[PDB]
Amino acid sequence: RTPSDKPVAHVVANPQAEGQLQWLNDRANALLANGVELRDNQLVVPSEGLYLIYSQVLFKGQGCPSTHVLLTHTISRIAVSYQTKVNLLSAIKSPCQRETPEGAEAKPWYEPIYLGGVFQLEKGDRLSAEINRPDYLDFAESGQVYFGIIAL
Amino acid sequence: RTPSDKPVAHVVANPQAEGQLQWLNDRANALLANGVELRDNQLVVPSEGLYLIYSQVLFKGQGCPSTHVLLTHTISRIAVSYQTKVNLLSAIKSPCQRETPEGAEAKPWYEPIYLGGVFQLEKGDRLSAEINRPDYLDFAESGQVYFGIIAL
Amino acid sequence: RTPSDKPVAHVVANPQAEGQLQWLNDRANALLANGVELRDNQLVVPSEGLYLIYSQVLFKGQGCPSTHVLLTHTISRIAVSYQTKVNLLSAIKSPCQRETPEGAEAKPWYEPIYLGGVFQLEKGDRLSAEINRPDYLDFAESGQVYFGIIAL
Secondary structure, three states: OOOOOOOOEEEOOOOOOOOOEEEOOOOOOOOOEEOEEEEEOOEEOOOOEEEEEEEEEEEEEOOOOOOOOOOOEEEEEEEEOOOOOOOOOOOEOOOOOOOOOOOOOOOOOOEEEEOOOEEEEEEOOOEEEEOOOOOOOOOOOOOOOOEEEEOO | OOOOOOOEEEEOOOOOOOOOOOEEEOOOOOOEOOOOOOOOOOOOOOOOEEEEEEEEEEEEEEOOOOOOEEEEEEEEEEEEOOEEEEEEEEEOEEEEOOOOOOOOOOOOOEEEEEEEEEEEOOOOOEEEEOOOOOOOOOOOOOOOOOEEEEEE | OOOOOOOOOOOEEEOOOOOOOOOOOOOOOEEEOOOEEEOOOEEEEEOOOEEEEEEEEEEEEEOOOOOOOOOEEEEEEEOOOEEEEEEEEEEEEOOOOOOOOOOOOOOEEEEEEEEEEEEEOOOOEEEEEEOHHHHEEEEEEEEOOEEEEEEO
């Protein structure tokens, strides 16, 4: 065989979908081996083990609007028994400070956030990397937005 | 039930501890297992190896001052052998290119810092995670401030 | 001494190359274990399997020039099957949201970029980790700009 036995997965955001982050393992450079499945846009964990659960999204806007743009990306985990979203890793970014553009429009900011950690998950647990602003997500990527778990 | 061995620790930082950054155990899905005591605010490694080392901090700031705020996050190894402290992972970032809220008091800034590399440790070595302006720490803390390792 | 059966690597930037990213396997903890080969400025892969590719670049400047910078970081795989560079993980950061600090000449900004994911490489597979603004690279640091793979 080739994909070893350790339950793995490296999902990439879908460039077609818009204003929504949909995870696609079915492109080049994407894995979903030995157990892991993609169900409700959430990775489901095959076996009780220890997993590293990184993820990365890449935000983009054109000029800084009024109303403070606070951006967030978080990896929550809904466990078998206690089926509620408990927050694993998270992070906020505020890419705007400015007067909110003027004498020259545009000039786009870019803002990536990365989340990585080692956590214990059981059989049937689910995970899901999500953001508060699917409008700002960016993708003429190939590797700009991703979500993955690997058993260790 | 704790399957999969290999020294492992994934520690989150203690919220109610005004500006000090004291890691803790028991919280969230914080781990220390297979002998990685967290002594004196340092993960203590048990036996040599290539350890995946990662950690994240989140600096939050309500309005920019007029003194250029630089913020560095660092993981330095204090080798059990040489006792010497060697800087492994380091990052530096500046939340604002000087604005300094003059009028219209406020507008928060969020600047996360994630560090992660693969390194060669030695049984007894100690890893330290430290920042420089701990007066800039976000106490919303779900799973925002963390430090961790795991044998590979 | 150096652990584990599995091939790994962790080269590091040369603070001598004028305007380019040159990796090295002899400074910092620049490993080149079991069959990995830092070659034409890229790691040639020893064998099949899931690898953990991670890297980090640092950027620096003082004040903002031509309204838009765009620091980018991409690790691309050039597969022995489909021989053509192909993005694996990418991030674009952009310092100076307009700004253009005329009176705050030489008032510095610091901008890092980490990233890393699991992928199923094969043998003879080459990996490049390249920036777009070597001139914006920071070099007053050690555990600053690295790039490595670890068979897992």
